[PDB]
Amino acid sequence: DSWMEEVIKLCGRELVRAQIAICGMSTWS
Amino acid sequence: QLYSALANKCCHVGCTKRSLARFC
């Protein structure tokens, strides 16, 4: 993971997984 | 919808993790 950038190619539930992960792991600036 | 736009975008070309970050 890298909150400065990251470009992913996900879909559906994986996309939501990435969302849940990204928005939950926002402890890092 | 905005989520559907993101959904299609990431599924086609991709999107930034920062982009899903602003959506959640």
Domain range for A4 is 1-29
Helix, coil or strand: residue A6: coil
Q: How many domains does chain A have?
A: 1
Query: What Å distances lie between residue B14 and A1, A13, A24, B8, CA to CA?
Result: 15, 15, 21, 8
Q: Name the residue facing B23 among A9, A12, A19 (closest C-beta).
A: A19
Burial of A29 (0-12, 13-18, 19+ CB in 10 A): exposed
CB–CB of A15 and B17 under 8 A? no
Specify the experimental method.
NMR
Interchain CB distance below 8 Å, A3 and B7: no
Å between B2 CA and nearest CA of chain A:
14
